RNA sequence: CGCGGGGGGAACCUGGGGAACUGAAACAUCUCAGUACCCAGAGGAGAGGAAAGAGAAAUCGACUCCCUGAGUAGCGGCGA
RNA sequence: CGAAGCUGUUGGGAAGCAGCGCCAGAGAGGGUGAAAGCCCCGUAGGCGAAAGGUGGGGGGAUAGGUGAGGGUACCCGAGUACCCCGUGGUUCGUGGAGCCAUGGGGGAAUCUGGGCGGACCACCGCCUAAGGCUAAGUACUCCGGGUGACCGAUAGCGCACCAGUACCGUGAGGGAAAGGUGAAAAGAACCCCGGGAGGGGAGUGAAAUAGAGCCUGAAACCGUGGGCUUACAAGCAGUCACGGCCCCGCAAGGGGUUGUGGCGUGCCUAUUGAAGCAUGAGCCGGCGACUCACGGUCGUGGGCGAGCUUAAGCCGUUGAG
RNA sequence: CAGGCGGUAGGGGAGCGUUCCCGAUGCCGAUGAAGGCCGACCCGCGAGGGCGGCUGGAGGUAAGGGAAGUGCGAAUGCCG
């Protein structure tokens, strides 16, 4: 196009606001009976309630609050067969994931649903579904080791 | 394009079975173009703002006016509001649109006729009226307004003041003026970027 | 300034992938009874049928 | 304001972008740029005393600051200031020209 | 006798002394803070710096400035 | 060094138009008697720095520094680490609380030695303090410069007119209003009223409703002069009905303003509740208050879409990327 | 054509003026822009907008969309 009435594809609106006037809703606020407003405003998150805010509960998860850190066990994860059914070449735990989808892993656990093309995909921990899908129906690897 | 060596060209590769989405074209283009403008706006108030003389007259009574903090809620230069503030909000994006945009435009500007040369000789790639010999012997003249890219520093100290056109060097994006204009030329299909 | 999720709440509760507010009620932990004969058991973990789906928000940065 | 204008008396000549005619300029100073070369129509209606020419008022004057000037061109078009590599008295000694170094 | 050095300089350095209000919709533990201020030597840099480290890896490799890690790990009427 | 024409005609004045000439790695701007590239300073570009001197890089580079393998065999940073309590910090309010300084006493060792992987013994792994130096890559700003979706001087820096001055204060210190003739003062000569003042003709003058509390100059306020109006009278005061009186429209009617009369409880708050002797409003001008940062949420035009986005940097950037 | 129609808060729809952007090496303008006194014509439902005279004496900004210290009777507000 050019410089002609570029009116921003239909719905555009800057939807600002304003101080006030004498045309309608404008120049009011809205409330009073409930005393909100503060030069240094409440916040305003959910601090209200003034009733233990349904927080008369208790901490159950005991997997935190120590001092240095938490538990540390190399990327524990999984997988499905329908996500890469695509091609193969070799289906290497880095050919894929190291390049593409999913992050790190010392322990790759295989699984899912589907029923695609199986063949010697390297793994560090399998699921039995794969086992029967590759017991005269496909090929498999070994595991970590170091 | 020429007559000296070749005589023929043209292409709509990019993606011709589409090239029809003006909607998004509008929105984004406009936004970045703004950005740049050195935004260094001031602010005055907060608590003290240049340590104020330290309060004044009492209250209950005072000089008739329940109020007495030299925050200065009246002086023309005292305790107001933070409209500006240095950060003039710096937002931007990638080539996802750098390409797509220049495409439909020029492609449509080709539905009007643009030109493309890619590489040539105008003369002593320096003098104003040398390239003039390339204005009336090329075809172009006062009206439609044109733009062109050539990365040789020769053309740089040559095009100097470009009344009617652009004159570029590296890799910018001045569709701006071209939007309100037309005519063009490029530096190799390579420079447009593969 | 960046807003930091409440570890407290995160130190206890869980949201079921689809916006739900559930955790283990309040009564059977230790069992303030003593006598020993009925009740002791009978309980699990529910949600909050009104405003909790609003609370979840302050925990959408850690999950 | 950069303290930088033009020549002096010697010869000089006015133009006619406000008055008319021409003359050998009289006393062009420097500071605010100003100067008055005999011509133009001016005179102050000063106080009537004996110290002055007697009657109140005065006489001669001009006034201006930026451009609006010219030099010596009886027949030829109009140039400005020439050059050299090894010519006249040492290498300098100019005074406006027709076509050479002097005229 | 020699140089110092007192003394001055707008922020910005380092360090040494170093509060309270306001929050928690009371308040004493926590907050603002090691902020504000006061003192001190200092240089355009200062200050900091060459490993008696990190931290789990058959590892990295002076100290400093930004980027993220994570606002997670955790401190905590683990409440704010 | 700096680039590159005028001329005529109306026009106060030409930077007004036209018929055509022009330089241009220099058509950034600033200005000259009315909205100029070619007209004063400049603007791309490059000459260049000193004698004075003076701040520093590359170059060169001087005193100051730089081999190894094996057997003998003693020596290497203390009231120090290591205990403890009283610990500050570290995210760490003692908590299972390790590591640095330790304040207080106790108190070793020297390489088959000595600190640590957050208590303590058993395997493993990195370092050698108790002497100290050490630039860069970093912070900051009066002021130099640019530029500012910086403001245009009741803004703004507190103040651009001599203010940190008037003034106040005991001190400490507190702290002010006040920009603007014109293009050029070219600034009123002279005579008449006359105390100097202030006036008037007249003059310089495009304009003195341009003249010195001088740009253009409104509002609260101030009447000379003008028209409609008033002494039988009950009034939030304006209204509308008709009608009347002086203005323009040939006309049809358009004004102004009231005569009688029907009509007439105002307002901004506050609130089961108002017209309101329950608040506030001396009056006009001007100044006056929910933006923004970053973060979060749910919508929206949207691109791509199992894919979808890159932080700070290195180059490039008048400017862009 | 049935319909609807006071409506404080409130939450929806549009628009209205008003200062800085680019369109501005574009265009109106001393055969007046900005300001202002007058209007009892032309459009807006209004928000406002035009247009014409007169005073007034150097700048202004299309359509357009881009930003928003703005939409000001007062607050014994602040100033003159």
mmCIF file with all atom_site columns, N, CA and C in Angstrom, chain A residues 15-74:
data_model
loop_
_atom_site.group_PDB
_atom_site.id
_atom_site.type_symbol
_atom_site.label_atom_id
_atom_site.label_alt_id
_atom_site.label_comp_id
_atom_site.label_asym_id
_atom_site.label_entity_id
_atom_site.label_seq_id
_atom_site.pdbx_PDB_ins_code
_atom_site.Cartn_x
_atom_site.Cartn_y
_atom_site.Cartn_z
_atom_site.occupancy
_atom_site.B_iso_or_equiv
_atom_site.pdbx_formal_charge
_atom_site.auth_seq_id
_atom_site.auth_comp_id
_atom_site.auth_asym_id
_atom_site.auth_atom_id
_atom_site.pdbx_PDB_model_num
ATOM 1   N N  . UNK A 1 15 ? -7.339  2.531   23.337 1.00 0.00 ? 15 UNK A N  1
ATOM 2   C CA . UNK A 1 15 ? -8.145  2.445   24.577 1.00 0.00 ? 15 UNK A CA 1
ATOM 3   C C  . UNK A 1 15 ? -7.494  3.026   25.848 1.00 0.00 ? 15 UNK A C  1
ATOM 4   N N  . UNK A 1 16 ? -7.161  4.314   25.804 1.00 0.00 ? 16 UNK A N  1
ATOM 5   C CA . UNK A 1 16 ? -6.597  4.988   26.969 1.00 0.00 ? 16 UNK A CA 1
ATOM 6   C C  . UNK A 1 16 ? -7.654  5.200   28.038 1.00 0.00 ? 16 UNK A C  1
ATOM 7   N N  . UNK A 1 17 ? -7.791  6.444   28.501 1.00 0.00 ? 17 UNK A N  1
ATOM 8   C CA . UNK A 1 17 ? -8.797  6.829   29.493 1.00 0.00 ? 17 UNK A CA 1
ATOM 9   C C  . UNK A 1 17 ? -8.884  8.352   29.629 1.00 0.00 ? 17 UNK A C  1
ATOM 10  N N  . UNK A 1 18 ? -8.846  8.834   30.871 1.00 0.00 ? 18 UNK A N  1
ATOM 11  C CA . UNK A 1 18 ? -8.896  10.266  31.130 1.00 0.00 ? 18 UNK A CA 1
ATOM 12  C C  . UNK A 1 18 ? -9.263  10.697  32.550 1.00 0.00 ? 18 UNK A C  1
ATOM 13  N N  . UNK A 1 19 ? -9.007  11.982  32.880 1.00 0.00 ? 19 UNK A N  1
ATOM 14  C CA . UNK A 1 19 ? -9.327  12.589  34.172 1.00 0.00 ? 19 UNK A CA 1
ATOM 15  C C  . UNK A 1 19 ? -10.830 12.624  34.462 1.00 0.00 ? 19 UNK A C  1
ATOM 16  N N  . UNK A 1 20 ? -11.565 13.480  33.739 1.00 0.00 ? 20 UNK A N  1
ATOM 17  C CA . UNK A 1 20 ? -13.013 13.609  33.938 1.00 0.00 ? 20 UNK A CA 1
ATOM 18  C C  . UNK A 1 20 ? -13.750 14.650  33.098 1.00 0.00 ? 20 UNK A C  1
ATOM 19  N N  . UNK A 1 21 ? -15.080 14.703  33.260 1.00 0.00 ? 21 UNK A N  1
ATOM 20  C CA . UNK A 1 21 ? -15.951 15.625  32.507 1.00 0.00 ? 21 UNK A CA 1
ATOM 21  C C  . UNK A 1 21 ? -17.389 15.636  33.052 1.00 0.00 ? 21 UNK A C  1
ATOM 22  N N  . UNK A 1 22 ? -18.363 15.902  32.174 1.00 0.00 ? 22 UNK A N  1
ATOM 23  C CA . UNK A 1 22 ? -19.773 15.865  32.566 1.00 0.00 ? 22 UNK A CA 1
ATOM 24  C C  . UNK A 1 22 ? -20.651 15.226  31.496 1.00 0.00 ? 22 UNK A C  1
ATOM 25  N N  . UNK A 1 23 ? -20.226 14.054  31.013 1.00 0.00 ? 23 UNK A N  1
ATOM 26  C CA . UNK A 1 23 ? -20.912 13.348  29.921 1.00 0.00 ? 23 UNK A CA 1
ATOM 27  C C  . UNK A 1 23 ? -21.512 11.996  30.316 1.00 0.00 ? 23 UNK A C  1
ATOM 28  N N  . UNK A 1 24 ? -20.982 11.402  31.382 1.00 0.00 ? 24 UNK A N  1
ATOM 29  C CA . UNK A 1 24 ? -21.465 10.115  31.854 1.00 0.00 ? 24 UNK A CA 1
ATOM 30  C C  . UNK A 1 24 ? -20.590 9.532   32.948 1.00 0.00 ? 24 UNK A C  1
ATOM 31  N N  . UNK A 1 25 ? -20.413 8.210   32.906 1.00 0.00 ? 25 UNK A N  1
ATOM 32  C CA . UNK A 1 25 ? -19.583 7.474   33.863 1.00 0.00 ? 25 UNK A CA 1
ATOM 33  C C  . UNK A 1 25 ? -18.343 8.257   34.293 1.00 0.00 ? 25 UNK A C  1
ATOM 34  N N  . UNK A 1 26 ? -17.727 8.936   33.326 1.00 0.00 ? 26 UNK A N  1
ATOM 35  C CA . UNK A 1 26 ? -16.518 9.743   33.518 1.00 0.00 ? 26 UNK A CA 1
ATOM 36  C C  . UNK A 1 26 ? -16.531 10.660  34.752 1.00 0.00 ? 26 UNK A C  1
ATOM 37  N N  . UNK A 1 27 ? -15.335 10.925  35.279 1.00 0.00 ? 27 UNK A N  1
ATOM 38  C CA . UNK A 1 27 ? -15.141 11.831  36.418 1.00 0.00 ? 27 UNK A CA 1
ATOM 39  C C  . UNK A 1 27 ? -15.821 11.397  37.715 1.00 0.00 ? 27 UNK A C  1
ATOM 40  N N  . UNK A 1 28 ? -15.814 10.088  37.976 1.00 0.00 ? 28 UNK A N  1
ATOM 41  C CA . UNK A 1 28 ? -16.414 9.535   39.199 1.00 0.00 ? 28 UNK A CA 1
ATOM 42  C C  . UNK A 1 28 ? -15.389 8.696   40.001 1.00 0.00 ? 28 UNK A C  1
ATOM 43  N N  . UNK A 1 29 ? -15.439 7.360   39.867 1.00 0.00 ? 29 UNK A N  1
ATOM 44  C CA . UNK A 1 29 ? -14.562 6.355   40.534 1.00 0.00 ? 29 UNK A CA 1
ATOM 45  C C  . UNK A 1 29 ? -15.354 5.040   40.686 1.00 0.00 ? 29 UNK A C  1
ATOM 46  N N  . UNK A 1 30 ? -16.270 5.010   41.664 1.00 0.00 ? 30 UNK A N  1
ATOM 47  C CA . UNK A 1 30 ? -17.187 3.879   41.851 1.00 0.00 ? 30 UNK A CA 1
ATOM 48  C C  . UNK A 1 30 ? -16.986 2.941   43.034 1.00 0.00 ? 30 UNK A C  1
ATOM 49  N N  . UNK A 1 31 ? -17.750 3.170   44.112 1.00 0.00 ? 31 UNK A N  1
ATOM 50  C CA . UNK A 1 31 ? -17.745 2.335   45.335 1.00 0.00 ? 31 UNK A CA 1
ATOM 51  C C  . UNK A 1 31 ? -18.381 3.037   46.552 1.00 0.00 ? 31 UNK A C  1
ATOM 52  N N  . UNK A 1 32 ? -17.630 3.119   47.655 1.00 0.00 ? 32 UNK A N  1
ATOM 53  C CA . UNK A 1 32 ? -18.038 3.845   48.872 1.00 0.00 ? 32 UNK A CA 1
ATOM 54  C C  . UNK A 1 32 ? -19.093 3.119   49.731 1.00 0.00 ? 32 UNK A C  1
ATOM 55  N N  . UNK A 1 33 ? -18.583 2.534   50.815 1.00 0.00 ? 33 UNK A N  1
ATOM 56  C CA . UNK A 1 33 ? -19.305 1.634   51.718 1.00 0.00 ? 33 UNK A CA 1
ATOM 57  C C  . UNK A 1 33 ? -18.214 0.624   52.060 1.00 0.00 ? 33 UNK A C  1
ATOM 58  N N  . UNK A 1 34 ? -17.355 0.422   51.057 1.00 0.00 ? 34 UNK A N  1
ATOM 59  C CA . UNK A 1 34 ? -16.122 -0.337  51.154 1.00 0.00 ? 34 UNK A CA 1
ATOM 60  C C  . UNK A 1 34 ? -15.031 0.699   50.887 1.00 0.00 ? 34 UNK A C  1
ATOM 61  N N  . UNK A 1 35 ? -14.212 0.990   51.895 1.00 0.00 ? 35 UNK A N  1
ATOM 62  C CA . UNK A 1 35 ? -13.197 2.040   51.776 1.00 0.00 ? 35 UNK A CA 1
ATOM 63  C C  . UNK A 1 35 ? -11.857 1.647   51.163 1.00 0.00 ? 35 UNK A C  1
ATOM 64  N N  . UNK A 1 36 ? -11.838 1.589   49.830 1.00 0.00 ? 36 UNK A N  1
ATOM 65  C CA . UNK A 1 36 ? -10.622 1.340   49.064 1.00 0.00 ? 36 UNK A CA 1
ATOM 66  C C  . UNK A 1 36 ? -9.908  2.666   48.834 1.00 0.00 ? 36 UNK A C  1
ATOM 67  N N  . UNK A 1 37 ? -8.882  2.644   47.984 1.00 0.00 ? 37 UNK A N  1
ATOM 68  C CA . UNK A 1 37 ? -8.099  3.833   47.653 1.00 0.00 ? 37 UNK A CA 1
ATOM 69  C C  . UNK A 1 37 ? -7.059  4.177   48.729 1.00 0.00 ? 37 UNK A C  1
ATOM 70  N N  . UNK A 1 38 ? -5.837  4.465   48.270 1.00 0.00 ? 38 UNK A N  1
ATOM 71  C CA . UNK A 1 38 ? -4.724  4.869   49.125 1.00 0.00 ? 38 UNK A CA 1
ATOM 72  C C  . UNK A 1 38 ? -3.626  5.496   48.268 1.00 0.00 ? 38 UNK A C  1
ATOM 73  N N  . UNK A 1 39 ? -3.102  6.629   48.725 1.00 0.00 ? 39 UNK A N  1
ATOM 74  C CA . UNK A 1 39 ? -2.003  7.292   48.033 1.00 0.00 ? 39 UNK A CA 1
ATOM 75  C C  . UNK A 1 39 ? -0.854  6.325   47.825 1.00 0.00 ? 39 UNK A C  1
ATOM 76  N N  . UNK A 1 40 ? -0.748  5.361   48.734 1.00 0.00 ? 40 UNK A N  1
ATOM 77  C CA . UNK A 1 40 ? 0.244   4.305   48.639 1.00 0.00 ? 40 UNK A CA 1
ATOM 78  C C  . UNK A 1 40 ? -0.448  2.961   48.543 1.00 0.00 ? 40 UNK A C  1
ATOM 79  N N  . UNK A 1 41 ? -1.559  2.953   47.786 1.00 0.00 ? 41 UNK A N  1
ATOM 80  C CA . UNK A 1 41 ? -2.501  1.823   47.633 1.00 0.00 ? 41 UNK A CA 1
ATOM 81  C C  . UNK A 1 41 ? -2.234  0.495   48.343 1.00 0.00 ? 41 UNK A C  1
ATOM 82  N N  . UNK A 1 42 ? -3.340  -0.126  48.771 1.00 0.00 ? 42 UNK A N  1
ATOM 83  C CA . UNK A 1 42 ? -3.346  -1.446  49.402 1.00 0.00 ? 42 UNK A CA 1
ATOM 84  C C  . UNK A 1 42 ? -2.238  -2.308  48.759 1.00 0.00 ? 42 UNK A C  1
ATOM 85  N N  . UNK A 1 43 ? -2.431  -2.661  47.486 1.00 0.00 ? 43 UNK A N  1
ATOM 86  C CA . UNK A 1 43 ? -1.462  -3.416  46.674 1.00 0.00 ? 43 UNK A CA 1
ATOM 87  C C  . UNK A 1 43 ? -1.872  -3.435  45.186 1.00 0.00 ? 43 UNK A C  1
ATOM 88  N N  . UNK A 1 44 ? -3.042  -4.038  44.855 1.00 0.00 ? 44 UNK A N  1
ATOM 89  C CA . UNK A 1 44 ? -4.015  -4.833  45.632 1.00 0.00 ? 44 UNK A CA 1
ATOM 90  C C  . UNK A 1 44 ? -4.218  -6.310  45.194 1.00 0.00 ? 44 UNK A C  1
ATOM 91  N N  . UNK A 1 45 ? -3.449  -7.227  45.797 1.00 0.00 ? 45 UNK A N  1
ATOM 92  C CA . UNK A 1 45 ? -3.588  -8.674  45.538 1.00 0.00 ? 45 UNK A CA 1
ATOM 93  C C  . UNK A 1 45 ? -4.706  -9.276  46.398 1.00 0.00 ? 45 UNK A C  1
ATOM 94  N N  . UNK A 1 46 ? -4.574  -10.546 46.796 1.00 0.00 ? 46 UNK A N  1
ATOM 95  C CA . UNK A 1 46 ? -5.552  -11.120 47.723 1.00 0.00 ? 46 UNK A CA 1
ATOM 96  C C  . UNK A 1 46 ? -5.000  -11.210 49.132 1.00 0.00 ? 46 UNK A C  1
ATOM 97  N N  . UNK A 1 47 ? -4.957  -10.047 49.771 1.00 0.00 ? 47 UNK A N  1
ATOM 98  C CA . UNK A 1 47 ? -4.495  -9.877  51.142 1.00 0.00 ? 47 UNK A CA 1
ATOM 99  C C  . UNK A 1 47 ? -5.702  -9.661  52.064 1.00 0.00 ? 47 UNK A C  1
ATOM 100 N N  . UNK A 1 48 ? -6.844  -9.321  51.453 1.00 0.00 ? 48 UNK A N  1
ATOM 101 C CA . UNK A 1 48 ? -8.108  -9.054  52.156 1.00 0.00 ? 48 UNK A CA 1
ATOM 102 C C  . UNK A 1 48 ? -8.538  -10.219 53.052 1.00 0.00 ? 48 UNK A C  1
ATOM 103 N N  . UNK A 1 49 ? -9.773  -10.682 52.870 1.00 0.00 ? 49 UNK A N  1
ATOM 104 C CA . UNK A 1 49 ? -10.290 -11.754 53.698 1.00 0.00 ? 49 UNK A CA 1
ATOM 105 C C  . UNK A 1 49 ? -10.443 -11.300 55.137 1.00 0.00 ? 49 UNK A C  1
ATOM 106 N N  . UNK A 1 50 ? -9.317  -11.112 55.826 1.00 0.00 ? 50 UNK A N  1
ATOM 107 C CA . UNK A 1 50 ? -9.333  -10.783 57.246 1.00 0.00 ? 50 UNK A CA 1
ATOM 108 C C  . UNK A 1 50 ? -10.003 -11.913 58.010 1.00 0.00 ? 50 UNK A C  1
ATOM 109 N N  . UNK A 1 51 ? -9.600  -13.146 57.687 1.00 0.00 ? 51 UNK A N  1
ATOM 110 C CA . UNK A 1 51 ? -10.229 -14.369 58.204 1.00 0.00 ? 51 UNK A CA 1
ATOM 111 C C  . UNK A 1 51 ? -9.329  -15.603 58.007 1.00 0.00 ? 51 UNK A C  1
ATOM 112 N N  . UNK A 1 52 ? -8.027  -15.449 58.269 1.00 0.00 ? 52 UNK A N  1
ATOM 113 C CA . UNK A 1 52 ? -7.034  -16.511 58.043 1.00 0.00 ? 52 UNK A CA 1
ATOM 114 C C  . UNK A 1 52 ? -7.011  -16.946 56.577 1.00 0.00 ? 52 UNK A C  1
ATOM 115 N N  . UNK A 1 53 ? -7.742  -16.197 55.747 1.00 0.00 ? 53 UNK A N  1
ATOM 116 C CA . UNK A 1 53 ? -7.908  -16.445 54.306 1.00 0.00 ? 53 UNK A CA 1
ATOM 117 C C  . UNK A 1 53 ? -7.840  -17.917 53.899 1.00 0.00 ? 53 UNK A C  1
ATOM 118 N N  . UNK A 1 54 ? -8.759  -18.713 54.441 1.00 0.00 ? 54 UNK A N  1
ATOM 119 C CA . UNK A 1 54 ? -8.834  -20.124 54.090 1.00 0.00 ? 54 UNK A CA 1
ATOM 120 C C  . UNK A 1 54 ? -7.407  -20.711 54.065 1.00 0.00 ? 54 UNK A C  1
ATOM 121 N N  . UNK A 1 55 ? -6.579  -20.226 54.991 1.00 0.00 ? 55 UNK A N  1
ATOM 122 C CA . UNK A 1 55 ? -5.186  -20.651 55.123 1.00 0.00 ? 55 UNK A CA 1
ATOM 123 C C  . UNK A 1 55 ? -4.978  -21.330 56.493 1.00 0.00 ? 55 UNK A C  1
ATOM 124 N N  . UNK A 1 56 ? -6.066  -21.876 57.044 1.00 0.00 ? 56 UNK A N  1
ATOM 125 C CA . UNK A 1 56 ? -6.024  -22.622 58.312 1.00 0.00 ? 56 UNK A CA 1
ATOM 126 C C  . UNK A 1 56 ? -5.673  -24.082 58.028 1.00 0.00 ? 56 UNK A C  1
ATOM 127 N N  . UNK A 1 57 ? -4.849  -24.261 56.998 1.00 0.00 ? 57 UNK A N  1
ATOM 128 C CA . UNK A 1 57 ? -4.422  -25.555 56.468 1.00 0.00 ? 57 UNK A CA 1
ATOM 129 C C  . UNK A 1 57 ? -3.190  -26.123 57.182 1.00 0.00 ? 57 UNK A C  1
ATOM 130 N N  . UNK A 1 58 ? -2.132  -26.401 56.408 1.00 0.00 ? 58 UNK A N  1
ATOM 131 C CA . UNK A 1 58 ? -0.843  -26.889 56.918 1.00 0.00 ? 58 UNK A CA 1
ATOM 132 C C  . UNK A 1 58 ? 0.080   -27.367 55.784 1.00 0.00 ? 58 UNK A C  1
ATOM 133 N N  . UNK A 1 59 ? 1.412   -27.195 55.933 1.00 0.00 ? 59 UNK A N  1
ATOM 134 C CA . UNK A 1 59 ? 2.366   -27.747 54.961 1.00 0.00 ? 59 UNK A CA 1
ATOM 135 C C  . UNK A 1 59 ? 2.478   -29.285 55.030 1.00 0.00 ? 59 UNK A C  1
ATOM 136 N N  . UNK A 1 60 ? 2.302   -29.949 53.878 1.00 0.00 ? 60 UNK A N  1
ATOM 137 C CA . UNK A 1 60 ? 2.424   -31.413 53.778 1.00 0.00 ? 60 UNK A CA 1
ATOM 138 C C  . UNK A 1 60 ? 3.717   -31.844 53.072 1.00 0.00 ? 60 UNK A C  1
ATOM 139 N N  . UNK A 1 61 ? 4.001   -31.249 51.914 1.00 0.00 ? 61 UNK A N  1
ATOM 140 C CA . UNK A 1 61 ? 5.222   -31.575 51.172 1.00 0.00 ? 61 UNK A CA 1
ATOM 141 C C  . UNK A 1 61 ? 6.482   -31.327 52.002 1.00 0.00 ? 61 UNK A C  1
ATOM 142 N N  . UNK A 1 62 ? 7.199   -32.412 52.299 1.00 0.00 ? 62 UNK A N  1
ATOM 143 C CA . UNK A 1 62 ? 8.456   -32.335 53.026 1.00 0.00 ? 62 UNK A CA 1
ATOM 144 C C  . UNK A 1 62 ? 9.638   -32.620 52.114 1.00 0.00 ? 62 UNK A C  1
ATOM 145 N N  . UNK A 1 63 ? 9.698   -31.874 51.010 1.00 0.00 ? 63 UNK A N  1
ATOM 146 C CA . UNK A 1 63 ? 10.782  -31.986 50.028 1.00 0.00 ? 63 UNK A CA 1
ATOM 147 C C  . UNK A 1 63 ? 11.356  -30.597 49.677 1.00 0.00 ? 63 UNK A C  1
ATOM 148 N N  . UNK A 1 64 ? 11.701  -29.865 50.737 1.00 0.00 ? 64 UNK A N  1
ATOM 149 C CA . UNK A 1 64 ? 12.219  -28.500 50.652 1.00 0.00 ? 64 UNK A CA 1
ATOM 150 C C  . UNK A 1 64 ? 12.720  -28.021 52.026 1.00 0.00 ? 64 UNK A C  1
ATOM 151 N N  . UNK A 1 65 ? 12.904  -26.708 52.160 1.00 0.00 ? 65 UNK A N  1
ATOM 152 C CA . UNK A 1 65 ? 13.319  -26.113 53.427 1.00 0.00 ? 65 UNK A CA 1
ATOM 153 C C  . UNK A 1 65 ? 14.382  -26.902 54.179 1.00 0.00 ? 65 UNK A C  1
ATOM 154 N N  . UNK A 1 66 ? 15.605  -26.932 53.645 1.00 0.00 ? 66 UNK A N  1
ATOM 155 C CA . UNK A 1 66 ? 16.735  -27.565 54.324 1.00 0.00 ? 66 UNK A CA 1
ATOM 156 C C  . UNK A 1 66 ? 17.802  -26.508 54.592 1.00 0.00 ? 66 UNK A C  1
ATOM 157 N N  . UNK A 1 67 ? 18.650  -26.241 53.591 1.00 0.00 ? 67 UNK A N  1
ATOM 158 C CA . UNK A 1 67 ? 19.673  -25.184 53.679 1.00 0.00 ? 67 UNK A CA 1
ATOM 159 C C  . UNK A 1 67 ? 20.503  -24.958 52.392 1.00 0.00 ? 67 UNK A C  1
ATOM 160 N N  . UNK A 1 68 ? 21.169  -26.011 51.852 1.00 0.00 ? 68 UNK A N  1
ATOM 161 C CA . UNK A 1 68 ? 21.931  -25.793 50.612 1.00 0.00 ? 68 UNK A CA 1
ATOM 162 C C  . UNK A 1 68 ? 21.093  -25.984 49.332 1.00 0.00 ? 68 UNK A C  1
ATOM 163 N N  . UNK A 1 69 ? 20.509  -27.174 49.166 1.00 0.00 ? 69 UNK A N  1
ATOM 164 C CA . UNK A 1 69 ? 19.756  -27.475 47.954 1.00 0.00 ? 69 UNK A CA 1
ATOM 165 C C  . UNK A 1 69 ? 18.571  -28.424 48.085 1.00 0.00 ? 69 UNK A C  1
ATOM 166 N N  . UNK A 1 70 ? 18.503  -29.366 47.143 1.00 0.00 ? 70 UNK A N  1
ATOM 167 C CA . UNK A 1 70 ? 17.445  -30.378 47.057 1.00 0.00 ? 70 UNK A CA 1
ATOM 168 C C  . UNK A 1 70 ? 18.062  -31.695 46.573 1.00 0.00 ? 70 UNK A C  1
ATOM 169 N N  . UNK A 1 71 ? 17.208  -32.646 46.189 1.00 0.00 ? 71 UNK A N  1
ATOM 170 C CA . UNK A 1 71 ? 17.679  -33.907 45.613 1.00 0.00 ? 71 UNK A CA 1
ATOM 171 C C  . UNK A 1 71 ? 18.216  -33.649 44.189 1.00 0.00 ? 71 UNK A C  1
ATOM 172 N N  . UNK A 1 72 ? 19.239  -34.418 43.809 1.00 0.00 ? 72 UNK A N  1
ATOM 173 C CA . UNK A 1 72 ? 19.923  -34.264 42.517 1.00 0.00 ? 72 UNK A CA 1
ATOM 174 C C  . UNK A 1 72 ? 20.144  -35.609 41.798 1.00 0.00 ? 72 UNK A C  1
ATOM 175 N N  . UNK A 1 73 ? 19.271  -35.894 40.834 1.00 0.00 ? 73 UNK A N  1
ATOM 176 C CA . UNK A 1 73 ? 19.348  -37.115 40.039 1.00 0.00 ? 73 UNK A CA 1
ATOM 177 C C  . UNK A 1 73 ? 19.139  -36.759 38.579 1.00 0.00 ? 73 UNK A C  1
ATOM 178 N N  . UNK A 1 74 ? 20.180  -36.964 37.745 1.00 0.00 ? 74 UNK A N  1
ATOM 179 C CA . UNK A 1 74 ? 20.207  -36.632 36.317 1.00 0.00 ? 74 UNK A CA 1
ATOM 180 C C  . UNK A 1 74 ? 18.851  -36.759 35.610 1.00 0.00 ? 74 UNK A C  1
#
